[PDB]
């Protein structure tokens, strides 16, 4: 082995890329490294989420800490590069700056609606502001941010998230500070609605299988995985890439003898979904970079005896 | 506890990156140990596991009234057929990977959806603490720093050892 | 009580999907598994969150100490 030998053999295939999810294969890479990227994407790629919630009033049916919690789960559409990290050794006054923190406010009172169509069940027409949504988090820019974030207001990635419900007379009033964090610390910071991989299917047939066996054999795998060839009448593999590895074949006695199920073994099929802040490819890039910095930061640290 | 008299005490809140993870990319909410089964024979939990997974997949409530099945119409067959139609293993197994090493585990592991109940309840620790006026012995308490007692069953143990200084 | 915001396992936002899911079952008269798919809930992780949610809050809300019944 040798880094050049790796470069010549490594390969990437991008099946589908989208603003929310990516499906791609890493080919001829070692499991230890694929796993690294996977772990890093979930737990070490920074994101912005609400961390501290300051209540001035909440007379809703939902308790403060619980409300605070859900607000923290709301994925904010914020570029984490636009923020610096908080130093948690300073007092509260010094701790939060215009490079540190994003402030969201929320201010709803519920009143009864006079103009309700008599005999109505719907709370939209019965009550004003009965339902509180993530979109109701108002972005309040501080200091330089009026400028910096003028071209991209802070908005939740999923506006229609139900946050709270109210009835006449109840109010919610809170400010939230949102900062950088990582999934390993708390899952609210994870930038994925999940990054995972599977090893690629390898279905290899240990002798020809034809006729009524072919049709039978073909039905042990999802539609399109196994083909029946015209001519030799024998079964062959169309694309393993569609296989779910149910191992259904291995149940029927006649086939368990004639098939081995494996993988194209390093060959990793990654699926990455973004929680909404960054694109998948950015999140994967950021992870490949994070791994490299670990190695670089370590190479440059002095070894103390 | 599940609804089959399989009661358990939480030992760890295991970090999700450290849990095993499925081909489906799911981590289990709860782990129960296979060694908790052969002495209790709660075979009904295994059935609930298949039925619950098949229900979550097909959008289906599953009737688990006693005596609706029998020896010619078993639930393992019934729910297993349902899982197979969904695209999962007919026996309710699933491939999983170690969260630590990253590698596929030796065999497919048994996973599914089981209804769980959280049981209502406290520990205590004492450095030293308030003593009673007459005997100068540790007060009874917990909510005031209660100190356990080394009892006579503990006396006898100390003699059986003869740790005489611990006794002293 | 109220819809959870994210799926416990996936991390995927699910809280914007409750009111629509009900409208799918009700108005469009779909079954549960078809409706879940139409909202983008693919992993059984995520289908479980909406399939088995109990909107218990709607019960809590009927006791409102701040209005003359």
């Amino acid at each position: 082995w040798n880094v050049e030998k790796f470069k010549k053999d490594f390969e990437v295939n991008i099946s589908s890329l989208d603003a929310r999810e990516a499906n791609f294969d890493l080919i001829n890479i070692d499991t230890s490294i694929a796993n690294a990227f996977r772990r890093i994407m979930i737990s070490e790629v920074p994101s912005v989420a609400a961390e501290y919630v300051y209540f001035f009033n909440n007379t809703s049916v939902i308790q403060d800490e619980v409300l605070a919690h859900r607000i923290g789960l709301v994925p904010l559409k914020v570029d984490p590069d636009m923020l610096t990290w908080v130093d948690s050794n300073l007092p509260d006054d010094e701790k939060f700056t215009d490079e540190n923190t994003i402030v969201l406010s929320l201010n709803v009172k519920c009143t009864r609606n006079p103009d309700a169509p008599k005999g109505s069940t719907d709370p939209k027409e019965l009550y004003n502001n009965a339902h509180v949504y993530a979109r109701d988090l108002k972005f309040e820019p501080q200091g330089r941010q009026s400028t910096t974030f003028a071209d991209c207001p802070v908005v939740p990635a999923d506006p229609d998230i139900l946050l709270a419900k109210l009835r006449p007379g109840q109010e919610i009033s809170l400010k939230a500070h949102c900062i950088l964090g990582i999934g390993g610390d708390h899952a609210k910071f994870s930038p994925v609605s999940t990054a995972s991989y599977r090893l690629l299917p390898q279905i290899n047939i240990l002798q020809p299988i034809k006729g009524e066996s072919a049709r039978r054999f073909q039905k042990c795998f999802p539609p399109g995985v196994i083909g029946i060839d015209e001519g030799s009448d024998e079964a062959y593999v169309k694309d393993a890439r569609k296989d779910t590895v149910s191992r259904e074949v291995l149940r029927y006695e006649e086939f368990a003898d004639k098939v081995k199920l494996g993988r194209v073994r390093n060959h990793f099929i990654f699926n990455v979904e973004s929680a909404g802040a960054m694109t998948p490819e950015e999140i994967f890039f950021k992870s490949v970079r994070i791994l490299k910095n670990k190695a670089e930061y370590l190479k440059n640290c002095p070894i103390t005896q | 506890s599940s609804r089959h008299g399989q009661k358990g005490v939480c030992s760890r809140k295991w970090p999700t990156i450290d849990m095993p993870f499925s081909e489906t990319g799911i981590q289990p909410d709860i782990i129960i140990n296979p060694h908790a089964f052969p002495s209790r024979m709660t075979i009904g939990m295994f059935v609930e596991s298949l039925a619950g997974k098949a229900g979550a997949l097909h959008g289906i409530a599953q009737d688990s009234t006693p005596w609706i099945f029998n020896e010619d119409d078993t639930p393992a067959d019934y729910f297993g057929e349902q899982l197979a139609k969904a695209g999962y293993n007919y026996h309710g197994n699933e491939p999983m990977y170690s969260g630590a090493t990253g590698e596929e585990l030796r065999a497919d592991i048994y996973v599914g959806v089981v209804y769980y109940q959280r049981l209502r309840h406290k520990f205590q620790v004492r450095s030293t603490g308030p003593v009673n006026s007459l005997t100068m012995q540790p007060v009874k308490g917990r909510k005031r720093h209660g100190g356990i007692r080394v009892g006579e069953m503990e006396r006898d143990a100390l003699i059986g050892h003869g740790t005489s200084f611990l006794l002293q | 009580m109220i819809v959870p915001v994210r799926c416990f396992s996936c991390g995927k936002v699910v809280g914007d999907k409750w009111e629509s899911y009900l409208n799918l079952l009700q108005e469009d008269e779909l079954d549960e598994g078809t409706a879940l798919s139409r909202l983008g809930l693919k992993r059984y992780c995520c289908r479980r969150m909406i399939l088995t949610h109990v909107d218990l809050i709607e019960k809590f809300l009927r006791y409102n100490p701040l209005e003359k019944r």
């Binding site: 539609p223 296989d243 779910t244 | 099945f69 695209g87 | -």
Partner: peptide
């Protein structure tokens, strides 16, 4: 005694990641 009735018309409702119903 009658058996507990089989539910008719059950299909695959699970596929390996990267595939869907009409790939089968």
């Amino acid at each position: 005694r009658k058996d507990v009735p089989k539910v008719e018309g059950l299909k695959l409702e699970h596929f390996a990641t990267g595939y869907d119903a009409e790939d089968f």
